Copies of this chain bind each other. A is one copy, B any other.
């Protein structure tokens, strides 16, 4: 009933059917992680039984952790790849976008799945639920999750999309960290910096391929790290810079300032990474 292919109920497919449907295509899973020692093990454990079956590859992309993220992820059997290791010829910039962009060079799967590493008790059918529409459908090259409280999503991302790309008004969670896409699409698109990366991929995919190429899947309920409002403001600012730029609007480049009563300025970036294709 939406112009967008939307699975509302627990998808039907079994692990075996999904695996059959691959037909020579490979699947990489990527867990970006910055200081997530309390949750990383459980996220890995939820996925690693799929490895050498439905999933051909799982990595943790460690984004500069100074806690025990790497040693715990290793103890869980995971290959852990630093930003450095992932693309050593290019100096490292901070932010999630960079980490995901670099993960394209550390993986070789025809389909790439992203899952956040701060999730509290993730379901082991997250990945199968997400590759469903890529594997069985035709035309689909991006799958976003939705769930059941997304303050930045509900107050910033979705109202700005109603304002400037109303066609995407039917995406329920445009900022979701859990999503899958073809390598062909991801290495052809630029990667916005920091927390701008999801909203950039969504709009560029739509602008380049239209809605027919985009699916969304219910993953149930989502629980993750709840962050203080001051941190979310910084995030929101980067979401706005990236969204305005994709819509042709000039962004000042001036970072958000907050007065807690003292003055702090958060970084914002107007620099995207290019399509990973150009690094061939």
A residues with a Cβ closer than 8 A to B are 8, 149, 151-152, 154-156, 158-160, 162-164, 166, 169-170, 172, 229-230, 232-233, 236-237, 240-241, 244, 249, 251-252, 254-259, 261, 268
Contact = CB atoms under 8 A, between A and B. Distances in A.
B156 A229 contact: no
B166 A252 contact: yes
A254 B151 contact: no
B151 A155 contact: yes
A159 B244 contact: no
B259 A162 contact: no
30 contacts: A151-B155, A151-B229, A152-B155, A154-B230, A154-B233, A155-B155, A155-B229, A155-B232, A155-B236, A158-B233, A158-B256, A159-B236, A159-B240, A159-B256, A160-B240, A162-B237, A162-B252, A162-B257, A162-B268, A163-B237, A163-B240, A163-B241, A163-B244, A164-B244, A164-B249, A164-B251, A164-B252, A166-B254, A170-B257, A172-B259
* Oligomeric state, in copies: 2
Nearest to A170: B257
Identify whether the interface residues of A are mostly helix, strand, loop, or mixed: helix
A38 to B, nearest CB: 26
A162 to B, nearest CB: 5
A229 B166 contact: no
B158 A156 contact: no
Contacts of A156: 155-156, 159, 236
A261 B163 contact: no
